Amino acid sequence: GWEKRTDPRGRFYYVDHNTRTTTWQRPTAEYVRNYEQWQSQRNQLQGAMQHFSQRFLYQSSYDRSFRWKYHQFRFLCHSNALPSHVKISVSRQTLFEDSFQQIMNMKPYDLRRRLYIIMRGEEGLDYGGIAREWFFLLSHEVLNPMYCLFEYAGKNNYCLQINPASSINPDHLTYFRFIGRFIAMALYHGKFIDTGFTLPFYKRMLNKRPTLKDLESIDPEFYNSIVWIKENNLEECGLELYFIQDMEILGKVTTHELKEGGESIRVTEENKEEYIMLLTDWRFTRGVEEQTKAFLDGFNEVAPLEWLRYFDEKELELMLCGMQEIDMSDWQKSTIYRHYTKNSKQIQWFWQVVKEMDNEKRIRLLQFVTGTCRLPVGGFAELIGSNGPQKFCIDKVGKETWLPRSHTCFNRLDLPPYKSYEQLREKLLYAIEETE
Ligand code: NA
DSSP states (O other), X not given: OOOOOBOTTSOBOEEETTTTEEESSOOOHHXXXXXXXXXXXXXXXXXXXXXXXTOBOOOOOOOSSHHHHHHHHXXXXXXXXXXXXXXXXXXXXXXXXXXXXXXHSXXXXXXXXXXXEEXXXXXXXXXXXXXXXXXXXXXXXXXXXXXXXXXXXXXXXXXXXXXXXXXXXXXXXXXXXXXXXXXXXXXXXXXXXXXXXXXXHHHHHTTOXXXXXXXXXXXXXXXXXXXXXXXXXXXXXXXXXXXXXXXXXXXXXXXXXXXXXXXXXXXXXXXXXXXXXXXXXXXXXXXXXXXXXXXXXXXXXXXXXXXXXXXXXXXHHHHHHOBOOOOHHHHHHXXXXXXXXXXXXXXXXXXXXXXXXXXXXXXXXXXXXXXOSOOOTTGGGSOEEBTEEOOEEEEOOOOTTSOOEEETTTTEEEOOOOSOHHXXXXXXXXXXXXXX
16 A cells, blocks of 8 residues: 555655555655565564674773773773663563653763663563663664665665665654664663674764775775776776766755866866765765764764774774674685685685684674674675675785785675785785774
8 A cells, every 4th residue: 555644743654554664755666675675684683683692892901902992992981981870661562662762862971871771571680681682673673664764775785874865754863863872872881783884884983084995885886987987097988977976866866066166077087086086975975964963963972983083994893793703614615716726825825814813803804805894694604795695705816916905795805816825914914904
């Protein structure tokens, strides 16, 4: 069905009989699509809960290492902790409605008080167990297409991003402010979430500029076109672009100027580094400005964003999701060679450097190759990418002088044919460690 009932405040909404849901969004074949693929995952959760509970982080007690950065942050929390507690009541099936009403009617500082959550009806005082389940359950509850808060650029659940069209929910900004408060709470209280935010989403929270590499993790299709513009320098040839980007916003198209007079200004050589930069800048910022500001205002109230300034995108995602034990056997068993084999010296050397690495250095290698620290239920075989499930792959691509290159959307590592164990090691270590 369809329908079109009305609100106490006279706003029109829809009653999807095909789902059994009420939304502000016109319930398309795609909305019904999105909602069912969301549904499944909501029921694939109680079996998965044990997986997510295996997540860990360090025990509270050189320098400029994730671990010090973390224990320093833990301290900043404990120092700003307020006495007494805040008890939130929820029901297993009312988890989102409930948490929203109670945390939005609370002043931000009350939320730094020690948490406790109550599962209505059900016997058992809190302790860590119900907060763990709460944080995880609600981390997914927020992605219900019903609320209009999110969408996915690619295949099924690939590349979580904010729905530019979220403005169709008059409370889109209250909800994105709540998500901000909530994700902040998780970091203040040490608990973990599995929302699915990407490294470039974590960069904004950190006030770090996303790059041309970073679009490969959201729009691999779009990242190539831009790579085509940069690499195929061109003889101008079969190309005519202007400094513009249109955007379909709830049907009506609108042409945005990347710069002033942009519709007028043609893309050319030398000129195109400016444009590539701007386009890249447009892609993360377009349609999601107020949603993202409300997130962040929402986040800042609870745990000041300035407290994360010394983390890079990877350290922060890892602070929110937690660490898993990377089993080297599942990794190796679930790895494919391209222009290489198992016996290639660069492969035998690659596994030798991965054998050295402690778990965090390996997690760091996983984030690099796949765009996240989160290893899925079922491990290295159940590795997913922009084109559905894709296994970890290493390809012989390069010049020896090059640094290894990742393809997070396909989980592929372009590993050049280095001349030595020590060359390859340093290069891999370098690519992974970045500049910390
Ligand atoms: Na991936």
